[PDB]
RNA sequence: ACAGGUUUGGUCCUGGCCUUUCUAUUAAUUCUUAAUAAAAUUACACAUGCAAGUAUCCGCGCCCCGGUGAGAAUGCCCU
RNA sequence: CACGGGAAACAGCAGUGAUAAAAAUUAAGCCAUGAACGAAAGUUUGACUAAGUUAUAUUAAUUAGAGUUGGUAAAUCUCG
């Protein structure tokens, strides 16, 4: 690509981006569908964060982990 | 080749027995090369059209040897009886074209039970066979599934309010387009 | 309380029924071969090595479980009418994880019509092989399992190879597995070729199929002609176990027969070639006592 | 990483101080920074044109 | 409602442990509330707690 | 090899056949032994034979041998917690030393099996990539799928040049 | 080369003579036949019930050539070539 | 390599053969190349139909949900595939494309009917 | 290395060189079509074109991709 | 190193001089991936894709030329 120190092209120095055609009746329902989809994926993201929290807690200080931490100490002595 | 249909007839014939006998077709064949160690790659193809390139190959100097999956006696000579592996081209002496054809024919005859090969004892895939799990059994249907409703209420196309359409059209003036109502449910064909 | 193939009362009979043949179990196959190892032992060490070989032959003779036909999978999880023709082909999705058994994987297929259904058995088994390949299995259907090549291999008395290949390829509760195993079991009693499975790991399955199908005429005469009577009394005991309500089973209880007489009641009551069975038993009786 | 023959580079750290001083002393005031040419919609400071939806 | 495959995942998950309850599993939206794009954001430094 | 009293002990097979794996708390093994007397034949044979097998499977454990300072042969295991494990070896044999060490501080068979069962999980059968880490390179070579274009040429309907040519007209 | 080859081929030890000289059974363990105790020669005569001293560490005369061959360090291109048949 | 920033993204790496694409569903850094270093491989995606005629896609749902809970961003085609699998809700871009296709079929049949008379 | 040629009137031993095998570049001769992979002289200097845009302004990215092997014995693996 | 000093930078895609035994198009697009932006429809990307050129290499064939003939090492008749 391009770097910070290279000048822009002459044909694009005098160019600005043009927005495409807009359909209102499609755009409104499209945006409400975007919001309805994003809230669902946000809830699923929260669910996965919670399950990761449960798994990491059960891996660090779990009921099974404490059993091993005690039986190893007993067998050592 | 007079047979053209039954390759093993030549192997059972007498002109094979008096010429080769109980020995393989490649027993008397000796390959000529540049030193004491032959090249790892043999001749690619020795029969170009009608011309024969010098000393021909054991199965390939005689046109009555047809490489095929039916004649197991011919294919057995190129497969070791003890180890069960296919002899390579430097081992046998055939040109590489006939070598690939030999490998393909050996595999294709093996896949038909004519040529024997090793069958190891393989344990069953599953340690415990349980069909009661929900992976293979039916699941209780959803209330939206039993009703005929899509999974989520926003899946269907709902008509936007006229006030919101006007609000959009006011802000997006100059970029407006033709409106489109609810789409048809079923797609027609051509 | 129907008897099961994995029940002890059946398995203990089947092990003695198959018997132990070291020269057949530990046979030189067609694999890559290596120079042997030599060490010198005493008589006791030789006996210890032989019994270790017997214990290994037990694992070699570990029986494959024979199961009933599984129910076809027909269920729909969701239906999206919007995807009626957006895609031409169907999307198959596999759940891959090493910590889950292959019986609990979710194999879900989105049809081009827009529905989401559970993958059927033939697609599920193919996908498990695609994403978890094991040696001896083919993703596509092999040509060897056709009825022409199967007869061709049967003519070369390779039924042991047929059974091992079928066990390796197919799942014991599938449909083609049972179909091909019943085909080999019908060929074996059509031709009287029980020798191939005399001491392999597939003898119990064939015996348990015959006790289900009530086809014992050839098996009993084969076992008698092979001078095996402990392999006939146990067989008729299996018949009585799996058919408790029968004129053959109740007559044994009412009369109190010994192991030698357990065969006569079967061959008189429910046997189809009873004349041949009686003639074979008479021929064995008139010869064994006189010669020994 | 950490070697025995690591050269004590001083110009690289002097340039940090020089650019830090020049960042504050020559800080562009927001007036001329956000100044706008209303004919070409061209920012005199940064050199960017305004989006056409903001015309 | 949960998506189809994910919902079937829980219906198979609790069935293995033996939960005979056929209650329909829901997905919460209490903490899924989000601000629109027109909502401006703060320009102060974030304090790490 | 040929040089040495016992050439066999300098082979990878001999080093691999010795199954003595220390715990994560084991740090130092200091062996002290004598070079005279019939009592220490077992300790001398242990130093001669089993030290390489232990070292091969415990590369991070520091093992140090000492000769002719204490009249009694012994071992001293310095752990991570600071506890010093003193093992007296006066008439124990070469095999007895190894069995005692494995008994007092070592890893169980189930402990080793769980570690190796976890290790085999890293290489995943369904993954794709290089032959060093994965079993398949390109997904063409799978039997049921589309073959590789470098082996079986694709039909004209799937090539990109024909699709561009039809769109051009 | 010929003299040494013939001397070595003549100085071989038959399994039967090994069994005779050590009064123990000679048992062959094929890799393909699994753990099957294949017996090749029997020690005719007095069979000793005392077993041979099991050496935990064998004192054998190894060679760096075969050690390299076994450890897979033979990276020479002259070892794994394809040659003609017998 | 050292990066100034970036985010973990579960995306598709085109690792394949000419006129024969093949994607690896992998979790990799945003500033790394498409076929460059990655964190952990998840699944595979096969763009062409096979002999039986199904489009074969692999998902390692457990690791995918683990990484997404850990904070892995998602790409649009990955969202489409996950929605088609049933693990995630359908992406609205697919819905609007299906509606556009419906309108294209409607105009096609209209023009076909009008061109025949 | 399964080796072979080569010292001497001649033999044995020691000992070096070369040949036999595979791969990559350039040169010569010849040459028909496709598929795939790769395009490799230069950290010597560059005419010219393109390669960083997006957006209701703010802002975000702008050797990130990609290119190269000059220097560094640099470095591999590990907290 | 990069405040500063030489001094006006392709060790980006193509291409040009010198040099070297060493020789790809100064061509088309974001349809599909990855990246950037925007809430978004969506835009850009000489990355990438689809291509043009090259016996550098493997495969199929529509093609037959090169090397060698004292020993190592397969193979020579007659002329100067
Ligand atoms: Mg900007
Ligand atoms: Mg490519
Ligand atoms: Mg001399
Ligand atoms: Mg050239
Ligand atoms: Mg680079
Ligand atoms: Mg230097
Ligand atoms: Mg610099
Ligand atoms: Mg430069
Ligand atoms: Mg640059
Ligand atoms: Mg260039
Ligand atoms: Mg030039
Ligand atoms: Mg070149
Ligand atoms: Mg040129
Ligand atoms: Mg040129
Ligand atoms: Mg272009
Ligand atoms: Mg793109
Ligand atoms: Mg786009
Ligand atoms: Mg070439
Ligand atoms: Mg002359
Ligand atoms: Zn030929
Ligand atoms: Zn491929």
PDB file of C-alpha atoms (C1' of nucleotides) in Angstrom, chain D residues 9 12 15 18-19 22 53, chain J residues 1-4 39-41:
ATOM      1  CA  UNK D   9      22.549   5.173  21.031  1.00  0.00           C
ATOM      2  CA  UNK D  12      17.718   8.297  18.923  1.00  0.00           C
ATOM      3  CA  UNK D  15      15.346  13.115  18.744  1.00  0.00           C
ATOM      4  CA  UNK D  18      13.483  17.397  20.186  1.00  0.00           C
ATOM      5  CA  UNK D  19      10.149  16.186  18.803  1.00  0.00           C
ATOM      6  CA  UNK D  22       8.502  20.840  18.948  1.00  0.00           C
ATOM      7  CA  UNK D  53     -23.165  14.847   2.475  1.00  0.00           C
TER       8      UNK D  53
ATOM      9  C1'   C J   1      20.390   6.256  15.359  1.00  0.00           C
ATOM     10  C1'   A J   2      18.106  10.778  12.738  1.00  0.00           C
ATOM     11  C1'   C J   3      18.051  16.795  16.321  1.00  0.00           C
ATOM     12  C1'   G J   4      21.104  17.876  12.479  1.00  0.00           C
ATOM     13  C1'   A J  39     -24.515   2.941  12.743  1.00  0.00           C
ATOM     14  C1'   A J  40     -25.441   1.783   7.689  1.00  0.00           C
ATOM     15  C1'   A J  41     -26.683   0.844   2.237  1.00  0.00           C
TER      16        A J  41
END
